């Protein structure tokens, strides 16, 4: 739909799921891929594999737009942090920078308590 040569890939990795969005430097969202939107549900939705297919699935549409270079944004503690990167690589798209954006409060909102499980 939009043919953009260089843009950025945000990959949010949480413990229950990983979202992968594709955007451009203008700060504009083109297309996104979620591990849940690939036909995975709650357990499997966290596994590094569902993150793999999520990444592959976004980069499908990004080569379909014909884009070449990208930056990678990794936000959050989950498993897909490592998994997704692999698919970004094997999907044969040039990797410019890989950054970690996981937000670290410098002090702040007092977290929920500890689950007694």
């Amino acid at each position: 739909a939009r043919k953009i040569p260089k843009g950025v890939i945000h990959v949010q990795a949480s413990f229950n799921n990983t979202i992968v969005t594709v955007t451009d430097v203008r700060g504009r969202v083109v297309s996104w891929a979620s591990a849940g939107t690939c036909g995975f549900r709650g357990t499997k939705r966290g596994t590094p594999f569902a993150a793999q297919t999520a990444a592959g699935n976004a980069i499908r549409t990004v080569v379909e737009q014909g884009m070449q270079r990208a930056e990678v944004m990794i936000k959050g503690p989950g498993l897909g942090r490592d998994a997704a990167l692999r698919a970004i690589r094997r999907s044969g798209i040039l990797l410019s920078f890989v950054r970690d954006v996981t937000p670290m409060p410098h002090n702040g909102c007092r977290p929920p308590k500890k689950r007694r499980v």
């Binding site: 995975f40 357990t43 499997k44 596994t47 590094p48 594999f49 569902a50």
Partner: protein, 154 residues
């Protein structure tokens, strides 16, 4: 088996064709240790399979087994209080075992008259990729792949 592991046993050869393979099959078809009868059954099977088709049965073995050999299956693991079906990959000996087995079972359940006939029929159908023994393997693959997400050793 907690301590000891298993030594390897001499792989024999079927008398007529000098195969490791055919010998495997006659040992697994065996009941009440009548080897006398089992050989007869297996050979009248080679005879019905040379009857129906003019292709070399020695090869139809290789096709029958290549056809039913699963490369993967699952196994039930207990991981973190969660019971998973984890798709463990299969060794070659185990593959041949599984193979001959599903063959033999699907052969014992057939509608036919003899065991020779049944075994021949299922060898024919498995070599064509046309039968229950194959379908079974594809099911094992279907239920492996759906569970593909649970192999963390991937």
């Amino acid at each position: 088996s907690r301590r000891g592991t298993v030594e390897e046993k001499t792989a024999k050869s079927d008398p007529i064709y000098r195969n490791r393979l055919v010998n495997m099959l006659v040992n697994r078809i065996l009941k009440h240790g009548k080897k006398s009868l089992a050989y007869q059954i297996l050979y009248r099977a080679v005879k019905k399979i040379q009857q129906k088709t003019e292709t070399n049965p020695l090869s139809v073995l290789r096709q029958a087994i290549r056809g039913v050999t699963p490369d993967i299956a699952v196994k039930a693991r207990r991981v973190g209080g969660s019971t998973h079906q984890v798709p463990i990959e299969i060794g070659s000996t185990q593959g041949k075992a599984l193979a001959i087995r599903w063959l033999l079972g699907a052969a014992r359940k057939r509608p036919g008259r003899n065991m020779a006939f049944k075994l021949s029929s299922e060898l024919v159908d498995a070599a064509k990729g046309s039968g229950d023994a194959v379908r079974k393997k594809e099911e094992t693959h279907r239920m492996a792949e759906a569970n593909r997400a649970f192999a963390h050793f991937r």
